[PDB]
Design brief:
The structure is cut from a larger assembly and holds two copies of chain A.
Chain A (H helix, E strand, L loop, with lengths): L9 H10 L3 E4 L3 H13 L8 E4 L30 H13 L4
Parallel strand pairs in A: 1-2
The complex binds 2-acetamido-2-deoxy-beta-D-glucopyranose.
Subcellular location (chain A): Cell membrane; Postsynaptic cell membrane
Protein name (chain A): Glutamate receptor ionotropic, kainate 2
Family (chain A): Belongs to the glutamate-gated ion channel (TC 1.A.10.1) family. GRIK2 subfamily.
Amino acid sequence: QLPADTKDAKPLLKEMKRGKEFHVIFDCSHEMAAGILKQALAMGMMTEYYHYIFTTLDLFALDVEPYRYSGVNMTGFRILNTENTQVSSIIEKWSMERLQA
Amino acid sequence: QLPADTKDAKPLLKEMKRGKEFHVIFDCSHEMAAGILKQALAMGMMTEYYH
Ligand SMILES: *[C@@H]1O[C@H](CO)[C@@H](O)[C@H](O)[C@H]1NC(C)=O
């Protein structure tokens, strides 16, 4: 269980490092998933060894640019059918309609 | 050698990962030192294995 006081998984992540649990399922929200990923990066928990799965259905929203070259074989799940052209067009319509982000 | 005309050592670090070189002795000004360390962190080449 991630600490409920704040999204600072420093002790829990260090415990995983001590336990050497490589394959690590998650069950989070993409907002908290981003923080967990960033804190994992600061511990070197994001290399060619670890292998995650995010139950979050918003994995594609993650800014994976700082992690794309890391070599982690991350996984996830996407239900938003963004591959379709109509869905994609509605996506840009949403992006332009959202004046404040 | 860190490529000249730029500071993006990305291919060098990737080759190091292919080369499995776990020990490194950099030699550069502190600005280039910070740059190369950040780029190494990008590839995740910065864990307790390396030195
Ligand atoms: C790539 O993913 C496989 C599982 O499909 C995993 O066993 C392997 O360690 C991964 N390679 C990495 C993370 O470099």
